[PDB]
Paper text:
However, fitting of the Hoc C-terminal domain (residues 281–376) from the AlphaFold model into the cryo-EM maps at the vertex-proximal [name] capsomers of the isometric and prolate capsids showed only two preferred orientations for the bound Hoc molecules. These two preferred orientations, which gave major contributions to the observed cryo-EM density, are related by 180° rotation around the hexamer axis. The Hoc chains fitted into the density corresponding to the two preferred orientations showed significant overlap, indicating that only one chain can bind to the center of the [name] hexamer. The 3.4 Å-resolution five-fold-symmetric reconstruction of the native prolate T4 capsid (EMDB-32109) also shows similar preferred orientations to the Hoc C-terminal domains attached to the vertex-proximal [name] hexamers. Similar fitting and refinement procedures were performed for the Hoc C-terminal domain attached in the two preferred orientations to the [name] hexamer adjacent to the “top” pentameric vertex of the prolate capsid located on the five-fold symmetry axis. The occupancy values for the two orientations of Hoc were 0.42 and 0.35, which are close to those in the isometric head. The Hoc C-terminal domain, in both the preferred orientations, interacts with six [name] subunits with an interface area of ~1200 Å2. However, at the [name] hexamers proximal to the capsid vertices, which deviate from the six-fold symmetry, Hoc binds in two preferred orientations, which are related by 180° rotation, in part because the other orientations involve clashes and, most likely, less stable interactions.
The outer surface of the head is decorated with the highly antigenic outer capsid protein Hoc and the small outer capsid protein Soc. The 376-residue Hoc is a monomeric fiber consisting of a string of four domains connected by flexible short linkers, of which the three N-terminal domains have an immunoglobulin (Ig)-like fold. The Hoc subunits bind near the centers of [name] capsomers, one per hexon, and have only a marginal effect on the capsid stability. Each T4-Hoc fiber attaches randomly to the center of [name] hexameric capsomers in one of the six possible orientations, though at the vertex-proximal hexamers that deviate from 6-fold symmetry, Hoc binds in two preferred orientations related by 180° rotation.
Numbering used by the authors:
A (entry chain Y): 281 to 376
B (entry chain E): 66 to 116
C (entry chain F): 117 to 521
D (entry chain A): 117 to 268
E (entry chain A), G (entry chain B): 320 to 369
F (entry chain E): 320 to 420
The structure:
Amino acid sequence: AKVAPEPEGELPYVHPLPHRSSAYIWCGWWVMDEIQKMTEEGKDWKTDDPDSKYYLHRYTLQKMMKDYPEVDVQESRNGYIIHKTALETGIIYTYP
Amino acid sequence: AEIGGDHGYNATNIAAGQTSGAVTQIGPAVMGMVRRAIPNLIAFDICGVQP
Amino acid sequence: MNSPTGQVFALRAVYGKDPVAAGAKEAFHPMYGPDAMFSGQGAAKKFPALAASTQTTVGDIYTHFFQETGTVYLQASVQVTIDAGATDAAKLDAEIKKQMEAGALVEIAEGMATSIAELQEGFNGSTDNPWNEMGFRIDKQVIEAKSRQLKAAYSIELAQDLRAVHGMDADAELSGILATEIMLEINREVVDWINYSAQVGKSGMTLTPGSKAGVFDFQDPIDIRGARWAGESFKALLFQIDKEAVEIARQTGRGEGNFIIASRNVVNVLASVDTGISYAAQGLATGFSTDTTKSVFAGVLGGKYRVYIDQYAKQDYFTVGYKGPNEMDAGIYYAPYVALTPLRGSDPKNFQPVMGFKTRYGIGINPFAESAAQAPASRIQSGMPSILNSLGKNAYFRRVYVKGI
Amino acid sequence: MNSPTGQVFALRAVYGKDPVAAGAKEAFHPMYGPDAMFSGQGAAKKFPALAASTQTTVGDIYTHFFQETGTVYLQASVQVTIDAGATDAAKLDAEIKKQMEAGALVEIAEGMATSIAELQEGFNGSTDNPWNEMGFRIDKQVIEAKSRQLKA
Amino acid sequence: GMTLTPGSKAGVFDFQDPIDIRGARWAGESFKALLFQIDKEAVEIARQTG
Amino acid sequence: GMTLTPGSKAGVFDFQDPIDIRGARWAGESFKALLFQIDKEAVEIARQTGRGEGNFIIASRNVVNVLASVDTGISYAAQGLATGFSTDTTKSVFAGVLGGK
Amino acid sequence: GMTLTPGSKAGVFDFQDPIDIRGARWAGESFKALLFQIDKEAVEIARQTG
C-alpha cells in the first residue's frame, strides 16, 4: 500500500535480464533469514522497519520486483534462485 | 629500627638509590639496552638499476 | 632480579642535530616511515604543511603526519580544499586519506640538485644551507619491586585435633595454602596486566569496516565473512587472530604475535576447527588441552602461537601478544627478587602459633611499549605499569571480545 | 563401607580471619577468581565496593564480586555512573560487565609497597595495618544405608 | 548460563533451530553441531568442579 | 578499463560486493576471487606494456595476510592460519612467491 | 513411536518432506537420510525384541 522511504543511494546492483523479463542479484543468507524473520509476527518486508540494520538489500528487492515480473534472487545457505512470486511470501524453504 | 625503608617509587629516587630507610642503595642494577630495530628494505628487484 | 630496582636503557635515533628537543622525530620506527625527503630536497626547501581548509595549488608538495604510518609528502594532482569540518586531527587524517585515495594528493620523495648539494654550509660563499644531520638519544626506564604477604594464625588445639582425627599436619597445609594463594595471586596480577595494558583489538587497521569496533561476533555475517555452518565460521576467527598478530608485528616492530590468552569458550572453538589451511571442518576437541585442570597451557595453534586458558575470564576474549626469544624483547617483565620467604612465630600471651609468608617481586613494562611516541619524557621514566603509560597503550598485546559462541 | 551410615569431610580454604563466618569466601574456588589484591594492595587499603549509583573516578579502584567468575578489582579510566536502577545482584553484575567491556572500567591487580609491607601489623610503632589472613573450615556430610529385599 | 548460545532454548537441543546447530545444513553438519555442543558441556563441567 | 567487471566499483576491489567476488559464499572462496583479480590485472599489464605479464606485487600487510590464508593453487575452497608467506615486516619485507609466478 | 521425528508422516519416509531428509540437498545427501532412518529402525528392533 505504502512506499518504502528512500534510503539515500548506493543501491546494490541488480542485473537486468530482458531474456525473460527477469533480474539477478546476490542477497545472502542474512537477508533471506532476516526477511524470514520479518514475515513471522504479521510484519512486512517490502516497506516496514526503515531503520533496519539490513534495510538496503530489502528496499532494492522491493523495487526490483516492480521493475521485473520474475526476479531471480539467490541466497547463500543453498544458493537457490527464488522467483518473484516465490519471493512474495518470504518463507523460502523450511523453518520457523 | 633499621626499617631499611624503600624508595618512593619515584623514577629519580629509584635511580638515585634514595630510600626512606637507613641504608642508601648503590644503583638500580642493569638489565641491558633496548635499541630500535632497523627496518628491512625492499631492494630493487622491482625496478631497474642501470648504474 | 639480583637486587631490587632494576633498570633498562633505550637508544633512539632522531634527526635534526638535536637528539633531545621538543618534537624531534625518531628515525627508525616500526610504524612511522622515514622522512624520505629529509636528506633529499627537504635539506633544500621547507614544504608547507597540510592543514584543514588548505586550498591546494597544482604541483606543490605538502608534508603531512598521520597518527599512524608516519611522515608523508603529497603532491597535488587537482586543486581541492581540505574541508575544515575535519578540524580534529583524526578527522584530518580521514580527510587526507580520502583525498589520497581519490588521487588528489599522491606521495613523493626526491633528492636535491647538484648545484644546491655541492654548496652545503657556505662553500663558495653561500649561506643558510646546513646539512640535515642526525643523532641518538639514549634514555632509561627503571623498575622497582613491590611486596606481597599473608598470615595464617591457627591454634595448637586445632593442630592436635586435626592430626588426631584426619592426620593432616595442620601447619604445613596452612603454609601450603598460604604459599599457594600468594603464588596464585601473583600469577593473576601478571595476567591482568596483560589484559589491562592490552590495546583494543579489532580496531583501526584490524577493523573490518562493517564490524562493531573491538568485538568479534559469530552472528554478524560481516565478521564471519558470510560463512554458514560451524565448519566455516570458525576459520573466520582464525583469520581474525591472524589480523591481530600481524598488526602486532606492525606496531611492535619486533615480530608477529606469538602467544594467545583466551577463555575456555574461544580455546574450545579453536580446538574444534581444522586450524591449518583446509576446506571446512568441525568436531571434537583433539588438538588442545581444553580443560583447565591438567594444565592451563592448552597447546600450540598451528605452530605459531602458544595458547593459554584464562580459567577466570570474566566474559569472553582472546588476547594476542608477542614474546621474543630474548628476555628483554618481552613487553612485560615479571622480575622476581625474593621468592616466598616463610616465617613462623607464636603469640606470647597465649602460645598459639602464627604462620606467614612474604615475597618481593615487582613488575615493569618494556620501553617502546607505546610504539607511537618518538621520544619519552624526562629521560628517566617509571618502568612500572600505570594508567598514564600502559592502559590501552602497550602495543605488544591486543584484546578482542568474542560473542555468540 | 564396613559400617552403616558413613560420613565425609569437606575442607574449604577460606580467607578472612574467621573460617566460620557469614560472607566468607573460599580461596581456591573453581568458579571464583582469586582475590588478586588480597595479599597485595588490599592489605594496605580497602577498595570501595562498586554498587549502584556510584560515581566512578578516573584512576581510582573499586571492588566487586560477580555471582559467577568471582571477585574482581576495577580501575576506572572514565568518570561514569553505574546506572543506579540496578537493584538485584544479577542486574548489577550485568551492568558492571557492560562497563568493563566499554573500557571505562578495567580489571587490575597490584603489589604492595615495601615501605608499607615492612611495617605490617604494628612494626616500628605503627598501627592499624593488620595482615590479611586465611584458614580452613572443614564441614561434615553424612548418609545412611537404605535397604532392599525380595522373596521367592 | 555459559553453555547457552544467546538465542537458544536453555536446556533443550533442537535440531530444527539454526542457532543450536550454528546454521548447519543437511545431516552431515548438524550432527557435528551436536558434537560441538557436547564439547561445550564438558568444558563447563571442567569449569564448575575444578 | 578492460579489467573492470561491468558491475564493479571501478578502481577498488570490494570483498563485500558480490559482483567483484563472483558470487562467492563464505571466506574460502571470496578470497579466491581476489587471486582472480590479481591475474586479470597482470594480464592487462601484459597487454599495455607489450613486454609480458606483471610478476611482482607490492602489497600492504592485510593483502599479503589474506593471500597467505588460502590455497593459492586451483584447489577447491580452503582457508586457515596464514602459513605460506612471511607477513612480518620485522623479518623481511619480501613476503614470498605467490603461486610460483 | 520411538522412530518418529515429531514432524514426519508416521510410517512413511518421504523424500519430499524436509523433516524426513534432514534438510538435505541433491541426491548425494538426501539418500543418507534413508540410511539414518534404517539405522533407527534397526535400533528399535533391538529395543523391542531384546
